[PDB]
PDB file of C-alpha atoms and ligand atoms in Angstrom:
ATOM      1  CA  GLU A   1      18.301 -23.445   9.879  1.00 45.56           C
ATOM      2  CA  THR A   2      19.069 -20.072   8.307  1.00 50.29           C
ATOM      3  CA  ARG A   3      15.500 -18.779   8.731  1.00 49.29           C
ATOM      4  CA  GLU A   4      15.322 -19.294  12.492  1.00 50.52           C
ATOM      5  CA  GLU A   5      18.835 -17.890  12.846  1.00 50.15           C
ATOM      6  CA  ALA A   6      17.959 -14.794  10.810  1.00 49.18           C
ATOM      7  CA  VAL A   7      14.854 -14.087  12.892  1.00 46.91           C
ATOM      8  CA  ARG A   8      16.822 -14.456  16.111  1.00 45.17           C
ATOM      9  CA  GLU A   9      19.508 -12.105  14.810  1.00 47.59           C
ATOM     10  CA  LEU A  10      16.919  -9.517  13.794  1.00 48.00           C
ATOM     11  CA  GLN A  11      15.305  -9.756  17.237  1.00 47.65           C
ATOM     12  CA  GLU A  12      18.685  -9.368  18.951  1.00 45.18           C
ATOM     13  CA  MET A  13      19.367  -6.288  16.823  1.00 47.16           C
ATOM     14  CA  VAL A  14      15.971  -4.834  17.723  1.00 45.45           C
ATOM     15  CA  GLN A  15      16.956  -5.188  21.394  1.00 45.66           C
ATOM     16  CA  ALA A  16      20.568  -4.075  20.971  1.00 46.90           C
ATOM     17  CA  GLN A  17      19.548  -0.901  19.169  1.00 48.91           C
ATOM     18  CA  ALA A  18      16.852  -0.099  21.722  1.00 47.08           C
ATOM     19  CA  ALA A  19      19.539  -0.315  24.410  1.00 49.09           C
ATOM     20  CA  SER A  20      20.953   2.966  23.093  1.00 49.55           C
ATOM     21  CA  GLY A  21      17.689   4.649  24.052  1.00 48.82           C
ATOM     22  CA  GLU A  22      17.343   6.188  20.589  1.00 46.45           C
ATOM     23  CA  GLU A  23      13.683   7.147  20.205  1.00 49.81           C
ATOM     24  CA  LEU A  24      12.722   5.107  17.133  1.00 45.17           C
ATOM     25  CA  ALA A  25      14.837   2.126  18.175  1.00 42.13           C
ATOM     26  CA  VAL A  26      13.011   2.043  21.506  1.00 40.79           C
ATOM     27  CA  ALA A  27       9.656   2.330  19.742  1.00 38.80           C
ATOM     28  CA  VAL A  28      10.460  -0.551  17.400  1.00 39.69           C
ATOM     29  CA  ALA A  29      11.267  -2.846  20.311  1.00 40.64           C
ATOM     30  CA  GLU A  30       8.019  -1.904  22.027  1.00 38.15           C
ATOM     31  CA  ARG A  31       5.937  -2.191  18.852  1.00 36.39           C
ATOM     32  CA  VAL A  32       7.065  -5.648  17.685  1.00 35.52           C
ATOM     33  CA  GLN A  33       7.126  -7.457  21.027  1.00 36.52           C
ATOM     34  CA  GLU A  34       3.997  -9.514  20.235  1.00 37.91           C
ATOM     35  CA  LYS A  35       4.985 -10.409  16.666  1.00 37.19           C
ATOM     36  CA  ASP A  36       5.668 -13.997  15.602  1.00 39.58           C
ATOM     37  CA  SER A  37       8.600 -15.268  13.554  1.00 40.95           C
ATOM     38  CA  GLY A  38       6.535 -15.060  10.382  1.00 39.37           C
ATOM     39  CA  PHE A  39       6.311 -11.289  10.799  1.00 40.56           C
ATOM     40  CA  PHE A  40      10.071 -10.906  11.088  1.00 42.26           C
ATOM     41  CA  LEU A  41      10.652 -13.171   8.074  1.00 42.41           C
ATOM     42  CA  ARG A  42       8.723 -10.751   5.853  1.00 42.09           C
ATOM     43  CA  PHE A  43      11.418  -8.141   6.353  1.00 44.88           C
ATOM     44  CA  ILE A  44      14.260 -10.634   6.331  1.00 46.64           C
ATOM     45  CA  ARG A  45      13.173 -12.216   3.047  1.00 40.35           C
ATOM     46  CA  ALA A  46      12.390  -8.858   1.444  1.00 38.62           C
ATOM     47  CA  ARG A  47      16.059  -7.985   2.033  1.00 36.47           C
ATOM     48  CA  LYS A  48      17.605 -11.326   1.014  1.00 38.06           C
ATOM     49  CA  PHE A  49      18.504 -12.295   4.588  1.00 39.48           C
ATOM     50  CA  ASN A  50      20.471  -9.105   5.191  1.00 41.20           C
ATOM     51  CA  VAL A  51      19.574  -8.537   8.827  1.00 39.22           C
ATOM     52  CA  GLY A  52      20.739  -4.923   9.008  1.00 39.18           C
ATOM     53  CA  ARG A  53      18.731  -4.016   5.928  1.00 37.84           C
ATOM     54  CA  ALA A  54      15.702  -5.878   7.252  1.00 38.26           C
ATOM     55  CA  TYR A  55      15.956  -3.830  10.452  1.00 40.16           C
ATOM     56  CA  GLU A  56      16.051  -0.588   8.454  1.00 38.53           C
ATOM     57  CA  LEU A  57      12.817  -1.627   6.728  1.00 40.34           C
ATOM     58  CA  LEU A  58      11.329  -2.368  10.135  1.00 39.68           C
ATOM     59  CA  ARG A  59      12.246   1.118  11.380  1.00 40.01           C
ATOM     60  CA  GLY A  60      10.275   2.740   8.565  1.00 39.80           C
ATOM     61  CA  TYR A  61       7.323   0.433   9.164  1.00 39.31           C
ATOM     62  CA  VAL A  62       7.214   1.380  12.836  1.00 34.22           C
ATOM     63  CA  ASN A  63       7.817   5.064  12.103  1.00 33.53           C
ATOM     64  CA  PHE A  64       4.685   5.152   9.948  1.00 35.35           C
ATOM     65  CA  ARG A  65       2.702   3.823  12.889  1.00 29.53           C
ATOM     66  CA  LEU A  66       4.154   6.458  15.216  1.00 31.90           C
ATOM     67  CA  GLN A  67       3.359   9.297  12.823  1.00 32.76           C
ATOM     68  CA  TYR A  68      -0.166   8.190  11.974  1.00 31.37           C
ATOM     69  CA  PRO A  69      -1.538   6.599  15.159  1.00 35.12           C
ATOM     70  CA  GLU A  70      -5.068   7.588  14.132  1.00 31.00           C
ATOM     71  CA  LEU A  71      -4.865   4.818  11.505  1.00 32.92           C
ATOM     72  CA  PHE A  72      -4.126   2.170  14.132  1.00 30.80           C
ATOM     73  CA  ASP A  73      -5.400   3.371  17.520  1.00 31.36           C
ATOM     74  CA  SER A  74      -9.022   2.237  17.412  1.00 30.97           C
ATOM     75  CA  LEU A  75      -8.911  -0.092  14.412  1.00 31.00           C
ATOM     76  CA  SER A  76     -12.076  -2.191  14.141  1.00 31.91           C
ATOM     77  CA  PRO A  77     -11.929  -5.216  11.795  1.00 32.49           C
ATOM     78  CA  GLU A  78     -15.698  -4.881  11.339  1.00 32.59           C
ATOM     79  CA  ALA A  79     -15.453  -1.289  10.097  1.00 34.60           C
ATOM     80  CA  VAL A  80     -12.542  -2.189   7.829  1.00 31.86           C
ATOM     81  CA  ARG A  81     -14.696  -4.954   6.356  1.00 29.65           C
ATOM     82  CA  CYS A  82     -17.369  -2.441   5.356  1.00 29.73           C
ATOM     83  CA  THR A  83     -14.847  -0.196   3.613  1.00 34.60           C
ATOM     84  CA  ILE A  84     -13.502  -3.179   1.682  1.00 31.52           C
ATOM     85  CA  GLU A  85     -17.006  -4.373   0.792  1.00 30.94           C
ATOM     86  CA  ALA A  86     -17.586  -0.885  -0.634  1.00 33.38           C
ATOM     87  CA  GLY A  87     -14.627  -1.601  -2.921  1.00 32.38           C
ATOM     88  CA  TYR A  88     -12.042   0.679  -1.315  1.00 32.86           C
ATOM     89  CA  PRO A  89      -9.472  -0.446  -2.211  1.00 33.53           C
ATOM     90  CA  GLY A  90      -9.938  -3.581  -4.327  1.00 35.33           C
ATOM     91  CA  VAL A  91      -7.746  -6.640  -4.915  1.00 32.11           C
ATOM     92  CA  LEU A  92      -7.501  -8.809  -8.032  1.00 29.90           C
ATOM     93  CA  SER A  93      -7.737 -12.582  -7.718  1.00 29.19           C
ATOM     94  CA  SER A  94      -4.907 -13.082 -10.217  1.00 32.73           C
ATOM     95  CA  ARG A  95      -1.352 -11.763 -10.029  1.00 31.43           C
ATOM     96  CA  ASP A  96       0.084  -9.672 -12.855  1.00 32.42           C
ATOM     97  CA  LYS A  97       2.916 -10.770 -15.143  1.00 29.37           C
ATOM     98  CA  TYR A  98       5.451  -9.693 -12.510  1.00 32.66           C
ATOM     99  CA  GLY A  99       3.807 -11.978  -9.944  1.00 31.16           C
ATOM    100  CA  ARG A 100       2.501  -8.932  -8.078  1.00 32.52           C
ATOM    101  CA  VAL A 101      -0.736  -8.626  -6.204  1.00 29.60           C
ATOM    102  CA  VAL A 102      -2.809  -5.974  -7.956  1.00 26.41           C
ATOM    103  CA  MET A 103      -4.759  -3.510  -5.819  1.00 27.13           C
ATOM    104  CA  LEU A 104      -7.484  -1.262  -7.189  1.00 25.18           C
ATOM    105  CA  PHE A 105      -9.121   2.075  -6.604  1.00 25.06           C
ATOM    106  CA  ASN A 106     -11.916   3.526  -8.711  1.00 25.40           C
ATOM    107  CA  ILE A 107     -12.580   7.108  -7.634  1.00 24.53           C
ATOM    108  CA  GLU A 108     -15.882   7.516  -9.526  1.00 27.13           C
ATOM    109  CA  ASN A 109     -18.577   8.404  -6.986  1.00 26.48           C
ATOM    110  CA  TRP A 110     -16.163   8.069  -4.058  1.00 27.53           C
ATOM    111  CA  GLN A 111     -17.820  10.172  -1.390  1.00 30.11           C
ATOM    112  CA  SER A 112     -15.169  11.276   1.090  1.00 29.45           C
ATOM    113  CA  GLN A 113     -17.723  12.305   3.697  1.00 29.98           C
ATOM    114  CA  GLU A 114     -19.153   8.767   3.685  1.00 32.18           C
ATOM    115  CA  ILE A 115     -15.871   6.839   3.458  1.00 31.97           C
ATOM    116  CA  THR A 116     -12.885   8.883   4.618  1.00 31.57           C
ATOM    117  CA  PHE A 117      -9.375   8.888   3.184  1.00 28.79           C
ATOM    118  CA  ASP A 118      -8.201   7.565   6.572  1.00 30.07           C
ATOM    119  CA  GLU A 119     -10.679   4.703   6.376  1.00 28.29           C
ATOM    120  CA  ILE A 120      -9.352   3.808   2.931  1.00 25.71           C
ATOM    121  CA  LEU A 121      -5.754   3.783   4.154  1.00 24.14           C
ATOM    122  CA  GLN A 122      -6.825   1.627   7.110  1.00 22.94           C
ATOM    123  CA  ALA A 123      -8.232  -0.838   4.585  1.00 26.13           C
ATOM    124  CA  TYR A 124      -5.001  -0.808   2.551  1.00 26.53           C
ATOM    125  CA  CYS A 125      -2.977  -1.558   5.674  1.00 25.12           C
ATOM    126  CA  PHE A 126      -5.348  -4.296   6.795  1.00 24.65           C
ATOM    127  CA  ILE A 127      -5.219  -5.992   3.387  1.00 27.63           C
ATOM    128  CA  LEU A 128      -1.443  -5.661   2.998  1.00 28.19           C
ATOM    129  CA  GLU A 129      -0.904  -7.207   6.433  1.00 28.72           C
ATOM    130  CA  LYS A 130      -2.812 -10.297   5.295  1.00 28.39           C
ATOM    131  CA  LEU A 131      -1.310 -10.333   1.803  1.00 29.82           C
ATOM    132  CA  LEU A 132       2.220 -10.256   3.206  1.00 27.67           C
ATOM    133  CA  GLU A 133       1.689 -13.600   4.953  1.00 23.95           C
ATOM    134  CA  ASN A 134       2.288 -15.034   1.484  1.00 25.37           C
ATOM    135  CA  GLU A 135       5.933 -15.758   0.732  1.00 27.53           C
ATOM    136  CA  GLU A 136       5.796 -15.010  -3.007  1.00 24.32           C
ATOM    137  CA  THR A 137       4.183 -11.632  -2.292  1.00 21.69           C
ATOM    138  CA  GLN A 138       6.931 -10.885   0.270  1.00 21.19           C
ATOM    139  CA  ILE A 139       9.235 -10.766  -2.756  1.00 19.80           C
ATOM    140  CA  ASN A 140       7.111  -9.737  -5.734  1.00 15.95           C
ATOM    141  CA  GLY A 141       5.160  -7.078  -3.843  1.00 18.83           C
ATOM    142  CA  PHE A 142       2.090  -5.267  -5.155  1.00 14.57           C
ATOM    143  CA  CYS A 143       0.953  -2.561  -7.520  1.00 12.46           C
ATOM    144  CA  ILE A 144      -1.986  -0.168  -7.507  1.00 11.35           C
ATOM    145  CA  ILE A 145      -4.290   0.697 -10.390  1.00  9.89           C
ATOM    146  CA  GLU A 146      -6.100   4.028 -10.004  1.00  8.57           C
ATOM    147  CA  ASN A 147      -9.010   4.718 -12.328  1.00  8.26           C
ATOM    148  CA  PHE A 148      -9.455   8.481 -12.327  1.00  4.58           C
ATOM    149  CA  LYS A 149     -11.998   8.622 -15.154  1.00  2.24           C
ATOM    150  CA  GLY A 150     -14.526   9.963 -12.652  1.00  3.56           C
ATOM    151  CA  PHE A 151     -12.179  12.326 -10.787  1.00  2.00           C
ATOM    152  CA  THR A 152     -14.256  15.491 -10.403  1.00  3.30           C
ATOM    153  CA  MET A 153     -13.044  19.019  -9.743  1.00  2.00           C
ATOM    154  CA  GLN A 154     -14.979  18.872  -6.472  1.00  2.00           C
ATOM    155  CA  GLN A 155     -13.159  15.724  -5.355  1.00  2.00           C
ATOM    156  CA  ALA A 156      -9.871  17.335  -6.382  1.00  2.30           C
ATOM    157  CA  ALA A 157     -10.558  20.502  -4.417  1.00  2.57           C
ATOM    158  CA  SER A 158     -11.514  18.466  -1.351  1.00  2.00           C
ATOM    159  CA  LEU A 159      -8.295  16.420  -1.166  1.00  2.00           C
ATOM    160  CA  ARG A 160      -6.211  17.400   1.862  1.00  2.00           C
ATOM    161  CA  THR A 161      -2.462  17.571   1.409  1.00  2.00           C
ATOM    162  CA  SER A 162      -2.045  15.885   4.794  1.00  3.28           C
ATOM    163  CA  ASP A 163      -4.038  12.874   3.526  1.00  2.00           C
ATOM    164  CA  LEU A 164      -2.039  12.662   0.290  1.00  2.31           C
ATOM    165  CA  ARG A 165       1.187  12.820   2.347  1.00  4.54           C
ATOM    166  CA  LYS A 166      -0.149  10.014   4.530  1.00  4.33           C
ATOM    167  CA  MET A 167      -0.543   7.846   1.426  1.00  2.03           C
ATOM    168  CA  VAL A 168       2.931   8.789   0.207  1.00  2.07           C
ATOM    169  CA  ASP A 169       4.325   7.745   3.574  1.00  2.00           C
ATOM    170  CA  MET A 170       2.386   4.485   3.555  1.00  2.00           C
ATOM    171  CA  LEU A 171       4.151   3.566   0.304  1.00  3.33           C
ATOM    172  CA  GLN A 172       7.524   5.151   1.022  1.00  4.74           C
ATOM    173  CA  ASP A 173       7.930   4.343   4.734  1.00  5.66           C
ATOM    174  CA  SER A 174       5.566   1.513   5.647  1.00  8.55           C
ATOM    175  CA  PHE A 175       5.724  -0.712   2.563  1.00  5.31           C
ATOM    176  CA  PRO A 176       8.547   0.489   0.245  1.00  7.26           C
ATOM    177  CA  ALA A 177      10.033  -3.016  -0.159  1.00  4.06           C
ATOM    178  CA  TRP A 178       6.687  -4.178  -1.546  1.00  6.18           C
ATOM    179  CA  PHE A 179       5.129  -1.227  -3.389  1.00  6.05           C
ATOM    180  CA  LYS A 180       6.260  -1.633  -7.005  1.00  2.30           C
ATOM    181  CA  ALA A 181       4.145   0.560  -9.287  1.00  3.06           C
ATOM    182  CA  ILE A 182       1.078   2.758  -9.410  1.00  3.46           C
ATOM    183  CA  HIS A 183      -0.836   3.244 -12.655  1.00  2.00           C
ATOM    184  CA  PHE A 184      -3.210   6.161 -13.113  1.00  2.00           C
ATOM    185  CA  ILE A 185      -5.660   5.799 -15.986  1.00  2.00           C
ATOM    186  CA  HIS A 186      -8.152   8.241 -17.543  1.00  2.00           C
ATOM    187  CA  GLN A 187      -7.089  11.135 -15.322  1.00  2.00           C
ATOM    188  CA  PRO A 188      -8.481  14.595 -16.201  1.00  2.00           C
ATOM    189  CA  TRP A 189      -6.464  17.704 -17.008  1.00  2.00           C
ATOM    190  CA  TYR A 190      -6.558  18.996 -13.422  1.00  2.00           C
ATOM    191  CA  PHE A 191      -4.804  15.863 -12.130  1.00  2.00           C
ATOM    192  CA  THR A 192      -1.654  17.885 -12.797  1.00  2.00           C
ATOM    193  CA  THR A 193      -2.323  20.141  -9.806  1.00  2.00           C
ATOM    194  CA  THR A 194      -2.904  17.138  -7.534  1.00  2.00           C
ATOM    195  CA  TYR A 195       0.276  15.487  -8.750  1.00  4.29           C
ATOM    196  CA  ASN A 196       2.310  18.677  -8.234  1.00  4.11           C
ATOM    197  CA  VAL A 197       1.130  18.859  -4.615  1.00  5.28           C
ATOM    198  CA  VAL A 198       2.558  15.414  -3.910  1.00  2.85           C
ATOM    199  CA  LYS A 199       5.716  15.642  -6.022  1.00  2.00           C
ATOM    200  CA  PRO A 200       7.944  17.325  -3.391  1.00  2.00           C
ATOM    201  CA  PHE A 201       7.343  14.465  -0.949  1.00  2.00           C
ATOM    202  CA  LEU A 202       8.284  11.734  -3.424  1.00  2.00           C
ATOM    203  CA  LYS A 203      11.833  10.435  -3.313  1.00  2.00           C
ATOM    204  CA  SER A 204      13.332   9.549  -6.696  1.00  2.00           C
ATOM    205  CA  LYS A 205      12.894   5.794  -6.219  1.00  2.00           C
ATOM    206  CA  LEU A 206       9.161   6.217  -5.646  1.00  2.00           C
ATOM    207  CA  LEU A 207       8.736   8.781  -8.424  1.00  2.00           C
ATOM    208  CA  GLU A 208      10.125   6.239 -10.886  1.00  2.08           C
ATOM    209  CA  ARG A 209       7.250   3.937  -9.905  1.00  2.00           C
ATOM    210  CA  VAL A 210       4.452   6.355 -10.846  1.00  2.00           C
ATOM    211  CA  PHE A 211       2.835   5.983 -14.261  1.00  2.00           C
ATOM    212  CA  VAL A 212       0.145   8.197 -15.768  1.00  3.04           C
ATOM    213  CA  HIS A 213      -1.649   6.859 -18.861  1.00  2.50           C
ATOM    214  CA  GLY A 214      -4.641   9.056 -19.591  1.00  2.00           C
ATOM    215  CA  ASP A 215      -6.844   7.535 -22.292  1.00  2.00           C
ATOM    216  CA  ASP A 216      -4.186   5.564 -24.202  1.00  2.00           C
ATOM    217  CA  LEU A 217      -4.097   2.209 -22.414  1.00  2.00           C
ATOM    218  CA  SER A 218      -1.800   0.523 -24.931  1.00  2.00           C
ATOM    219  CA  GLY A 219       1.228   0.677 -22.636  1.00  2.00           C
ATOM    220  CA  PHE A 220      -0.965   0.056 -19.595  1.00  2.00           C
ATOM    221  CA  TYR A 221      -2.291  -3.218 -21.050  1.00  2.00           C
ATOM    222  CA  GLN A 222       1.285  -4.295 -21.728  1.00  2.00           C
ATOM    223  CA  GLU A 223       1.877  -4.026 -17.983  1.00  2.00           C
ATOM    224  CA  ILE A 224      -1.415  -5.375 -16.640  1.00  2.00           C
ATOM    225  CA  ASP A 225      -3.276  -8.130 -18.530  1.00  2.00           C
ATOM    226  CA  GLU A 226      -6.625  -6.803 -19.773  1.00  2.00           C
ATOM    227  CA  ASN A 227      -7.931 -10.314 -19.191  1.00  2.00           C
ATOM    228  CA  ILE A 228      -7.293 -10.154 -15.430  1.00  2.00           C
ATOM    229  CA  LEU A 229      -8.945  -6.754 -14.889  1.00  2.00           C
ATOM    230  CA  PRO A 230     -12.567  -5.977 -13.966  1.00  2.00           C
ATOM    231  CA  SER A 231     -14.661  -4.173 -16.561  1.00  2.00           C
ATOM    232  CA  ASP A 232     -14.483  -0.904 -14.606  1.00  2.00           C
ATOM    233  CA  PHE A 233     -10.704  -0.931 -15.071  1.00  2.00           C
ATOM    234  CA  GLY A 234     -10.860  -1.694 -18.787  1.00  2.00           C
ATOM    235  CA  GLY A 235     -10.793  -5.474 -18.399  1.00  2.00           C
ATOM    236  CA  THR A 236     -12.926  -8.461 -19.363  1.00  2.00           C
ATOM    237  CA  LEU A 237     -13.794  -9.640 -15.844  1.00  2.00           C
ATOM    238  CA  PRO A 238     -17.011  -8.733 -14.023  1.00  2.00           C
ATOM    239  CA  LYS A 239     -17.406  -5.216 -12.619  1.00  2.00           C
ATOM    240  CA  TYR A 240     -15.412  -5.074  -9.410  1.00  2.00           C
ATOM    241  CA  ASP A 241     -17.361  -6.193  -6.351  1.00  2.00           C
ATOM    242  CA  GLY A 242     -15.675  -5.736  -2.977  1.00  2.00           C
ATOM    243  CA  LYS A 243     -17.742  -8.530  -1.429  1.00  2.00           C
ATOM    244  CA  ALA A 244     -15.608 -11.371  -2.811  1.00  2.00           C
ATOM    245  CA  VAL A 245     -12.297 -10.025  -1.478  1.00  2.00           C
ATOM    246  CA  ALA A 246     -13.940  -9.214   1.836  1.00  2.00           C
ATOM    247  CA  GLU A 247     -15.247 -12.769   2.266  1.00  2.00           C
ATOM    248  CA  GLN A 248     -11.835 -14.255   1.389  1.00  2.00           C
ATOM    249  CA  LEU A 249     -10.023 -12.023   3.886  1.00  2.00           C
ATOM    250  CA  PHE A 250     -12.438 -12.209   6.832  1.00  2.00           C
TER     251      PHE A 250
HETATM  252  C1  RET B   1      -0.136  11.360  -7.443  1.00  2.00           C
HETATM  253  C2  RET B   1       0.422  10.319  -6.519  1.00  2.00           C
HETATM  254  C3  RET B   1      -0.337   9.880  -5.507  1.00  2.00           C
HETATM  255  C4  RET B   1      -1.728  10.393  -5.356  1.00  2.00           C
HETATM  256  C5  RET B   1      -2.777   9.611  -5.114  1.00  2.00           C
HETATM  257  C6  RET B   1      -4.164  10.118  -4.980  1.00  2.00           C
HETATM  258  C7  RET B   1      -4.564  11.461  -5.525  1.00  2.00           C
HETATM  259  C8  RET B   1      -5.107   9.367  -4.381  1.00  2.00           C
HETATM  260  C9  RET B   1      -6.460   9.904  -4.284  1.00  2.00           C
HETATM  261  C10 RET B   1      -7.487   9.256  -3.726  1.00  2.00           C
HETATM  262  C11 RET B   1      -7.365   7.930  -3.093  1.00  2.00           C
HETATM  263  C12 RET B   1      -7.935   7.707  -1.724  1.00  2.00           C
HETATM  264  C13 RET B   1      -6.791   6.918  -3.750  1.00  2.00           C
HETATM  265  C14 RET B   1      -6.685   5.601  -3.128  1.00  2.00           C
HETATM  266  O1  RET B   1      -6.025   4.738  -3.686  1.00  2.00           O
HETATM  267  C15 RET B   1       0.319   8.818  -4.662  1.00  2.00           C
HETATM  268  C16 RET B   1      -0.441   7.591  -4.167  1.00  2.00           C
HETATM  269  C17 RET B   1      -0.038   9.534  -3.359  1.00  2.00           C
HETATM  270  C18 RET B   1       1.782   9.048  -4.366  1.00  2.00           C
HETATM  271  C19 RET B   1       2.429   8.856  -5.729  1.00  2.00           C
HETATM  272  C20 RET B   1       1.849   9.831  -6.759  1.00  2.00           C
END
């Protein structure tokens, strides 16, 4: 069967490339040695069974883990659960019109000293790992909705460029085959400074996936069904509660 053959070919390529001794190639081989066929199929299917292209995706995925080991070193499922229960980030029960999983972040009252940017990215990675077990999601991918209505100047001043770059790299290196769009709503005037900080690190393909809506949600609602969104993202569903997602995942 083509699936089993494709996985075997990807595995052989992982080994063949590592044979060169090239640093990342060697790291990939080491870092995927415990993975099952399902894991390899994610990359294979995301690249329409093009093994070479699947391997390139895998390189970026592993590179992210090499560059940001603090996100993976002492990962505790229990701690990740708490972050998710707190609603950071959230996940909708229904897919959007593109068949995408919709992830959520509402910055209002986010206290970075209580729940760190790193902890939030750990939660993203933990969720995406589970979400990508699903074969439709392996193709359709996901989007992110960011409600910045409550983005304060204090929050803005506290954001570290190294943390913003980490998020860029999560989307651009770890999950680029799956990250499809990010929608910022209700962002204040000083969002411009935050955006400008990140802009140099965004490749053109990723830049084209960033949308900023402010207070006019007309276009936004054309993308994401108002009737699938929680009330704190302008929708008709109950205010987002991280408990439901958390229970489903764990
Ligand atoms: C502008 C912009 C970004 C900035 C995101 C920010 C400012 C996130 C701030 C807080 C958190 C933790 C959100 C969690 O979802 C992205 C994602 C990096 C890269 C694409 C464009």
